[PDB]
A paper describes a structure:
We develop a hierarchical approach to designing multi-component protein assemblies from two classes of modular building blocks: designed helical repeat proteins (DHRs) and helical bundle oligomers (HBs). We first rigidly fuse DHRs to HBs to generate a large library of oligomeric building blocks. We then generate assemblies with cyclic, dihedral, and point group symmetries from these building blocks using architecture guided rigid helical fusion with new software named WORMS. X-ray crystallography and cryo-electron microscopy characterization show that the hierarchical design approach can accurately generate a wide range of assemblies, including a 43 nm diameter icosahedral nanocage.
To build such structures by helix fusion using our building blocks with smaller and weaker interfaces that give rise to cooperative assembly, we systematically split each DHR at the loop in the center of four repeats, resulting in a hetero-dimeric structure with two repeats on each side. Tetrahedral, octahedral, and icosahedral assemblies were generated from C5, C3, and C2 building blocks placed on their respective point group symmetry axes, connected by the split DHRs heterodimers. Following fusion, sequence design was performed at each of the two new junctions. For another design, T32_Wm-24, while the full cage did not assemble, we were able to crystallize the polar-capped trimer component (C3_HF_Wm-0024A) and solve the structure by X-ray diffraction to 2.69 Å. The structure clearly shows that both of the newly designed junctions (from HF and WORMS) are as designed, matching the design model.
Numbering used by the authors:
A (entry chain A), B (entry chain A), C (entry chain A): 1 to 269
């Protein structure tokens, strides 16, 4: 279906990007051989130095244009991944049945479209590129929650999916309006790690950090935004360690990482 | 399933292609350092110039072989995408139930196999590479039409899929036998845009341009083939603008693009 | 679902790898222009030669670090493909229903995790990189066998899947404990080709070569291991020719390749 279409388009970008990288390598090589030829033939030091500077200026321009093509190829790749993830979000919302979760997933399609369209307009912006990455990770976490809700029909899992899909929409409009915000950037990642864990205490704690960063970004108090980031940083690290201790380990640090997330959310509420 | 297999093989091509690009960069660097060493030590101008020309000849050969590896990596990627798309076409035809559409999808598998096998035989051919691209786009449009037909069981949608899958087969054998034909190249793309639109008037208009380009290519009248291309060019541009005005816009140009496609098909029939 | 997640991560690797390749090209170009400048200005031959050697040493280090990044990018790609293939293996085992085949598929998840984790620890090892490739191919063959078993519910196909999934686990722990073993490396590939063929005689013949290579690797008789490789080499080539003669050909060599695999397995038992 649509999955094969994206792989076909992403592969065209890789072939085209590798084609342009070789184009830059080929041009830089022509300049070197031409410079060595002129340096060995000419005797005027003034002309030799000017031939060297124009090659160094052109070589620096060749590299910059190649960084631009990689920049545009990355935004085009992130645009295809965002649309594919949003398309997966709406179909999973259909397989649930709730018209309310269908309205929530419909906004993610609108959020993914608008954020990916602005990144492709000016890929040189690093904030619009990173904000689109986290929105993609938020949609992926929402899709993983929706797919789990339709496995056994557990009413807690279905409500778990609704609360975290709506929270993903919340932690998406925030980074869309404030891409350069480190507090909103970290509270989103803490929610993605809290969605995959499935803990009710971790989901309500991550969303509270999103609202704290939202209110701190309503006004323009920089000391207020930095406090939410440090609170969201320790929460995110506690969830990543809890995921490592559950996948492997010997249950020793697994109980230790629980109190890490518990104490981190304690001083944040 | 098969989708994960293609991604695994396409990723091996990207790693291998990046490995060979660095191999060329490493060899070009060795030649530059060796040339600077010999130019600074030797005093005979005759020997210095010959050392420079053999490096420029070898550097030009290194770049050409790297363009060849990118050329072979692109054909191998297009071969994997074509087979994956044809595999998706036959299973969607099974989910419909019509044995007639199963015979139509069976030809696409044969058309995708033969076209992708000839492109991998000599990837330096640009016509066989581009003709395979449009055949892939034709199969993707056929798959999107087949998946929509099995959504609600609408009898119009199921017949809409049969007419456009057969038309995709028609606009595939044509570009296979005439890869260097611009008229057949454009009538195919007009059909792909007409399939996604779902308009009955746009589907019969695009196929009529395929038959006009087919009869013009039966004989060898070049003025006849150019007339179909210009007719298919305006039809394709009208469908792409109609898709832009339906996705966004304010319904103003949406009605304007309808008369564009209407008038374009008028002077083509 | 998970398929879109892997494509998103694999595309980030390609963009990042292309970003680092250009970084190496940009640094190598700066060294060339700086060297040409110093060679044209300075007159002391002793200083010129030392400026050349330090550039040749740095250029050789730049290329080596770029080979390392390609090395680490390949292991990260093979780790994502292995986990995605193992995830596909467990769900197909669930769709069968046998708790025994679910325990077999559960080991592949453990085998794919452990082998991919050791390859990412030291990607410079070529044996751990190649052993992970064949384990991926073994899981893919197991998934293709499991998907075919749930098509028509044929009891022979369901048992065909169980025998070859268990054999895939057998030809996975072997290459995991002996990555540098050519006999175990070839008996695995002979099984992958024997799984796709579906021949009962080819499956029991490939597994017998796995047990022969297993017992030869129990001890450390090098002449014993080389005998199994030559026996597994001819079996693998006979299955690849049998696949070519069945896909195309004119049934002439198709019967000839059958006696090839028959005689190859004859002198191996």
């Amino acid at each position: 279906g649509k999955e094969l279409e994206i792989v076909a388009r992403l592969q065209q970008l890789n072939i085209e990007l590798a084609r342009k990288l070789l184009e830059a390598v080929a041009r830089l090589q022509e300049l070197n051989i031409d410079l060595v030829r002129k340096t060995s033939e000419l005797t005027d030091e003034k002309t030799i130095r000017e031939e060297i500077r124009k090659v160094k200026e052109e070589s620096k321009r060749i590299v910059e244009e190649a960084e631009q093509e990689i920049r545009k190829a990355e935004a085009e790749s992130l645009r295809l991944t965002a649309e594919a993830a949003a398309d997966a979000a709406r179909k999973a919302a259909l397989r649930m049945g709730d018209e309310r979760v269908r309205r929530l997933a419909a906004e993610l399609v609108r959020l993914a479209q608008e954020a990916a369209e602005e990144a492709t307009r000016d890929p040189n912006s690093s904030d619009q590129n990173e904000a689109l990455r986290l929105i993609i990770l938020a949609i992926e976490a929402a899709v993983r929650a929706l797919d789990k809700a339709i496995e056994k029909g557990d009413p807690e899992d279905r409500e778990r999916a609704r609360e975290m899909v709506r929270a993903a929409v919340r932690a998406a409009e925030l980074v869309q309006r404030y891409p350069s915000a480190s507090a909103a950037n970290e509270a989103l990642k803490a929610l993605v790690a809290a969605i995959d864990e499935g803990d009710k205490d971790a989901a309500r704690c991550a969303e509270e950090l999103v609202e704290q960063a939202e209110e701190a970004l309503r006004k323009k108090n920089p000391e207020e935004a930095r406090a939410v980031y440090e609170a969201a940083r320790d929460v995110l690290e506690a969830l990543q360690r809890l995921e490592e201790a559950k996948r492997r380990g010997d249950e020793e640090e697994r109980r230790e990482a629980e109190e890490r997330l518990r104490q981190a959310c304690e001083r944040a509420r």
